[PDB]
Design an enzyme around this catalytic site. Structure first.
Site, PDB file in Angstrom:
ATOM      1  N   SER A 148      41.997  36.597  45.537  1.00 27.60           N
ATOM      2  CA  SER A 148      42.087  37.598  46.607  1.00 27.60           C
ATOM      3  C   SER A 148      42.936  37.072  47.775  1.00 27.60           C
ATOM      4  CB  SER A 148      40.663  38.005  47.032  1.00 27.60           C
ATOM      5  OG  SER A 148      40.590  39.339  47.500  1.00 27.60           O
ATOM      6  N   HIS A 205      35.669  42.244  41.131  1.00 27.11           N
ATOM      7  CA  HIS A 205      36.737  41.548  41.842  1.00 27.11           C
ATOM      8  C   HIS A 205      36.389  40.075  41.951  1.00 27.11           C
ATOM      9  CE1 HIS A 205      40.193  40.908  44.338  1.00 27.11           C
ATOM     10  NE2 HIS A 205      39.533  40.761  45.475  1.00 27.11           N
TER      11      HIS A 205
END
Length: 387
Positions: free
Chosen positions: A205, A334
């Protein structure tokens, strides 16, 4: 053979800085710029020594338009290993900055490959995928404070050491800190049995973009592994402008990047002399593997997928396209890799960090599709002479 890794952070420091036209004199290159084209429009990379200087032109363009200049290696650096902790003391032009990491060393005589995670050992990959590694967490806040307000903390230790860099993006501080860690690992190498030719970097990320810049900007990183980096990472600014409600020049923050990118190129990313496909290509000819997650639209994987395919052309040109791989797939949270992603990258960790003769020939697996030829058609299928 073509080198898999290099002894120095930058083998091309001796290269000649490129021309850097003022934003308004920049040509409109609407599709993806040609990564082999010299910055002055005067031709195309011919050999390996050329690619090193073209890599340094891309570096200089990314520093000039969106990040700020990575400082050179400091005048003084002293690293020590005591109590399981590596501490690195940096001196430069009357300032100091100290990094400290709790590392974990495998048993035995060694040497051991290295994995540098962002804010953690191994980042967002599991400890199991690096159980036999030296594991070095990069505590990024010891250089620049992570935050998700578009505002910068100019009191963080990097900005105190380079106060005239208060306009630079935080990603240049973070890239510089990773290179100071590797400096310290080199210094203590015989004490923890580090194998300086098998250092990896990974993060997810925001930590994925951090790993991308970190390994792109340091030629001693033998495997760069950005995980779900999204907009500002592997994604091209141009292509992200064509899809919608993704991280792009319009809405990213301007502490990680330089406000100058928004002011000079928002709505006119066709005028950039570079795009992020060439940020990826700064890793070439070293090994590269990245992971996507189309289940989150904010990551804009059509742009990431497109930009990754563009970057691959540089590995193809040098005949090392099996050092490049990715896996785009949904069905996972995620920053928690799908099963196929864990397996794909494990082939890359085996070959390029552990040294095993696994094969990695065509690992371009993606549930994401896009007309990527449309973006690279002009320049494509070039080849470089490798002596």
């Amino acid at each position: 053979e073509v080198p898999l890794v290099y002894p120095k952070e930058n083998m091309g420091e001796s290269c000649k800085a490129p021309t850097l036209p003022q934003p308004a004199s920049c040509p409109s290159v609407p599709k993806l710029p040609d990564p082999f084209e010299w910055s002055d429009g005067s031709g195309r990379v011919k050999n390996l020594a050329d690619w090193e200087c073209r890599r340094n032109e891309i570096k200089a363009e990314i520093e000039n338009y969106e990040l700020g200049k990575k400082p050179a290696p400091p005048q003084s650096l002293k690293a020590t290993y005591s109590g399981g902790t590596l501490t690195v003391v940096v001196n430069d032009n009357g300032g100091s900055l100290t990094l400290t990491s709790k590392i974990s060393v495998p048993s035995g005589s060694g040497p051991f490959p290295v994995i540098i995670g962002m804010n953690s050992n191994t980042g967002s990959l599991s400890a199991g995928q690096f159980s036999d590694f030296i594991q070095v967490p990069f505590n990024h806040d010891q250089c620049a404070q992570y935050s998700m307000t578009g505002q910068k903390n100019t009191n963080a230790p990097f900005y105190k050491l380079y106060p005239n860099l208060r306009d630079a993006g935080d990603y240049i501080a973070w890239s510089w800190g990773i290179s100071r860690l590797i400096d310290g690992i080199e210094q203590v190498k015989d004490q923890i049995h580090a194998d300086m030719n098998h250092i990896g970097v990974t993060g997810c990320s925001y930590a994925g973009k951090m790993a991308l810049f970190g390994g792109a900007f340091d030629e001693r990183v033998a495997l760069t592994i950005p995980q779900e980096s999204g907009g500002g990472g592997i994604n091209a600014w141009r292509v992200s402008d064509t899809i919608g409600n993704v991280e792009k020049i319009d809405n990213t923050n301007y502490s990680w990047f330089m406000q100058a990118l928004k002011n000079n190129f928002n709505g006119k990313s066709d005028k950039l002399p570079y795009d992020h496909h060439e940020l990826i290509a700064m890793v070439a000819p070293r090994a590269f593997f990245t992971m996507g997650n189309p289940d989150y639209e904010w990551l804009g994987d059509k742009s990431g997928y497109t930009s990754a395919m563009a970057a691959l052309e540089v590995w193809k040109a040098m005949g090392v396209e099996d050092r490049f791989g990715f896996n785009f797939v949904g069905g996972h949270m995620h920053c928690s890799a799908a099963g196929t992603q864990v397996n794909d990258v494990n082939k890359f960790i085996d070959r390029f960090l552990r040294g095993k003769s696994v094969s990695t020939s065509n690992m371009l697996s993606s549930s994401v599709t896009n007309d990527y030829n449309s973006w690279i058609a002009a320049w494509k299928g070039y080849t470089i002479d490798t002596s």
